[PDB]
């Protein structure tokens, strides 16, 4: 009756758009496709690679619940964007938690700087930070035992584009993209960027707060022309890339991957 | 019980590397002398086969027509492609006053008395179709009554 109308606004009230409410129960597993049902119009074709943790093998059997993401509806048939990004929000929440007590503590282990800041990895994910953040002083973890255990003390974060440089060792110590496009500029600043869509000439890795990068086909590997970028890297994956070129005018930052 | 009239048979060609491959089209129409009519259009390399095919086609996909006695229930227009057809009910004795393909369809249908002109094109295949359409659309008094929520005496 209005039973159904009320039930509709009820079901509106008991779901939200992003990957927030851990609701999809894994109702069929087959390599290489997981699939859930979070109270959406259809079931997700999940990769297996959004769900294996830190050494390669699966972690969740039938009935298990992770939220995914949304705001994109129907490409022909199907429903979602991946739950792994979901996870990013959780990471953001832990990073935010720092603010409360002015100190987020986990483990951060940063061996080296792709682009001037040691890389820190938290749980499954690994992030890149600006060069200062790795060390509190001028200590430098190059003399430290390789891939050492500390935590991360945050030095610097870019707040829009996601780059976070964190503080290893020293426990005792405690319009918008395009005007100032000189931060990752200078010749070869390495970046960690998720690829988006590979347009048979390109790969379109673009992460640093509303920009566009290409890594088109010529570098990508150490073979030139026979490569076909879909075979050689991925879809949706955070990779090794650096700038090689910026035009701040005809917004074409032309990144590379042969480095 | 069913009567079947081959209206027309026409030779049609297909040009190929060698030369011309000829074939035959047969337009037939069948009816039970009551409401039921059906035309069939068959095609084959030889005539008789084509005719047979046409007949077969006709025999399935028939159509019912409401007939007030020997004639139609009211004047009815029917169109299909070029051929636009008018047919008008007529008094017992007058016979089927209609031309060509149109006549044949009427005869099988078991209309005995009509005044029927084919305007426009008179391409047998089209005209028969038109005729069929006209017959089909034609509603009876009872049917009209049913539609309108009335008795037959209210409509007259």
């Amino acid at each position: 009756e209005s039973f159904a109308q009320l039930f509709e606004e009820s079901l509106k009230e008991i779901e939200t758009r992003p990957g927030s409410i851990v609701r999809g129960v894994v109702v069929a597993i087959d390599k290489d496709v997981v699939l859930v049902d979070a109270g959406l119009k259809s079931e997700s074709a999940i990769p297996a690679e959004q769900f294996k943790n830190a050494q390669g093998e699966l972690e969740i059997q039938v009935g298990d619940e992770v939220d995914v993401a949304l705001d994109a509806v129907e490409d022909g048939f199907g429903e979602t964007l991946l739950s792994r990004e979901k996870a990013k929000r959780h990471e953001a929440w832990i990073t935010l938690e720092k603010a409360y007590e002015d100190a987020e503590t986990v483990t951060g282990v940063i061996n080296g700087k792709v682009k001037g800041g040691f890389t820190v990895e938290l749980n499954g994910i690994r992030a890149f930070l600006p060069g200062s953040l790795v060390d509190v002083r001028p200590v430098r973890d190059t003399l430290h035992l390789e891939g050492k255990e500390l935590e991360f003390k945050v030095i610097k974060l870019d707040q829009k584009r996601n780059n976070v440089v964190v503080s290893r060792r020293a426990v005792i110590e405690s319009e918008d993209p395009w005007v100032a496009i000189a931060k990752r500029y200078p010749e070869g600043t390495k970046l960690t960027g998720r690829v988006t869509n590979l347009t048979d000439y390109g790969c379109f890795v673009e992460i640093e707060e509303g920009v566009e990068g290409l890594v088109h086909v010529s570098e990508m590997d150490w073979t030139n022309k026979n490569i076909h970028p879909s075979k050689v890297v991925n879809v949706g994956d955070v990779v090794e890339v650096m700038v090689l070129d910026i035009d701040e005018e005809r917004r074409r930052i032309s990144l590379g991957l042969k480095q | 019980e069913l009567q079947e009239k081959l209206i027309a048979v026409n030779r049609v060609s297909k040009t190929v590397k060698g030369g011309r491959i000829f074939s035959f089209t047969a337009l037939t129409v069948v009816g039970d002398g009551n409401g039921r009519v059906g035309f069939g259009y068959g095609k084959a390399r030889e005539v008789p086969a084509a005719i047979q095919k046409a007949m077969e086609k006709a025999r399935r996909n028939m159509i019912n027509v409401a007939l007030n006695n020997g004639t139609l229930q009211h004047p009815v227009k029917g169109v299909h492609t070029g051929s636009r057809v008018f047919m008008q009910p007529a008094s017992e004795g007058t016979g089927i006053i209609a031309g060509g393909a149109m006549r044949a369809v009427l005869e099988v249908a078991g209309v005995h008395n009509v005044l029927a002109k084919a305007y426009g094109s008179t391409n047998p295949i089209n005209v028969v179709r038109a005729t069929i359409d006209g017959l089909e659309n034609m509603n009876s008094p009872e049917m009209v009554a049913a539609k309108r929520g009335k008795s037959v005496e209210e409509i007259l």
Partner: protein, 70 residues
């Protein structure tokens, strides 16, 4: 496309950079375009035709894509 060779920069690299700059400018293309007079009508026609082609590529092909090849 004004360029200056940086200190301890290779020649080849510099050349490549220059080429890239030129490409960006679309200088060669521009030159090609202005070699001969294009009637306004012709210009219009090309633009519209090109647009049409683009549209065809975008939508029809997308529709095709939905259905598998084998």
């Amino acid at each position: 496309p004004v360029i200056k060779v940086r200190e301890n920069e290779p020649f080849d690299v510099a050349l490549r950079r220059f080429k890239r700059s030129c490409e960006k400018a679309g200088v060669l293309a521009e030159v090609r375009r202005r070699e001969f007079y294009e009637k306004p009508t012709t210009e219009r026609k090309r633009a519209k035709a090109s647009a049409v082609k683009r549209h065809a590529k975008k939508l029809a092909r997308e529709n095709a894509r939905r259905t598998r090849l084998y």
